[PDB]
Structure 1
Amino acid sequence: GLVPRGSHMEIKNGLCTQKYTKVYAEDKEKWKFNAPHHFIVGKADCEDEYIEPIEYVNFQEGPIKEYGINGVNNEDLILMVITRLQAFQDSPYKCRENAMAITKLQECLMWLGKRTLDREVKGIEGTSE
């Protein structure tokens, strides 16, 4: 594969291992709607010049009712992690650190949905303000 990396930016995170993969994203300049939406997970062992793609993740950009359903939502990915972390808890791999993480993630979901429910009490959902 080995596609080129010029526009892309490597999302580096001190809490992220970066041992076997890297995460890459669109240039800040190309960010649409205030945020990044086209991400690549690629193998770490590559020239800076190139990215070896393992996986592409694209998020919904533009409101759903104007542009259609053209990508995922943050909630969806979190669900996957939870589902899998709950599968790990229901295995020999059960540990405290996983239940801690599952709890944090559900509370994430909750906080985000609070934002939804509050923008719904005011009436306004997916609004320009």
Structure 2
Amino acid sequence: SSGLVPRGSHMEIKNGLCTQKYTKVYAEDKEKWKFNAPHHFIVGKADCEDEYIEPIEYVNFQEGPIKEYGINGVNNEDLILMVITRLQAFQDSPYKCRENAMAITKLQECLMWLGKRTLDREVKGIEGT
């Protein structure tokens, strides 16, 4: 109940575009990455000691084909969808600002490009292999 776990082999996702002023993002060890990608992220509090993670939230992504492991996580599109929704809500508030508008546009165009990968794999017939 210390709201606190051993950092273990979890890797801290540290990226120049993120300030880590309040939160830190961890994922699992690269050695445990399945299918070329990380799938088990933790958002913890940044002022936590480095040997531990103070967990705020866990986010797990679909890992393996739904065909044999079933539905077991979220998709990138789900998270992007939540952000667009929230930002759009702020646009409908006194916090409306141009930076949010650009961010919404970028996120929509992001969804468009990911969708294009999918639609192309349709026209090629190999969807979800």
The answer as to 2:35 corresponding to 1:33 is yes
SS in structure 2 at match of 1:119: helix
Give aligned-pair identity as a percent.
100
SS of match in other structure, 1:94? coil
Deviation per CA, 1:10-41, whole angstroms, max 9, x where unpaired? 00011112001100010001100100000000
Deviation at 1:44, TM superposition (A): 0.6
- The aligned runs of 1:1-129 (5 Å cut-off) are 1-127=3-129
Q: Measure how far apart 1:50 and its partner are.
A: 0.5
1:67 Cα shift?
A: 1.1
TM-score by length of 1: 0.97
Q: CA deviation at 1:124?
A: 0.7
Per-residue Cα deviation, 1:30-63 (whole angstroms, up to 9, x for no partner): 1001000000000011111110000000000001
How far apart, in 2, do the equivalents of 1:79 and 1:20 lie? 23
CA RMSD of aligned residues (A): 0.6
Task: Measure, in 2, the Cα distance between the counterparts of 1:15 and 1:31.
Answer: 23
Structure 1 stretch displaced more, 101-110 or 60-69: 60-69
TM-superposed deviation, 1:6:
1.7
TM-score, normalised via structure 2 length: 0.97
Q: What is the deviation of 1:99? A: 0.4
User: Can you list the C-alpha shifts for 1:104-125, whole angstroms capped at 9, x where unaligned?
Assistant: 0000000000000000001111
Gaps of 5+ in 2: none
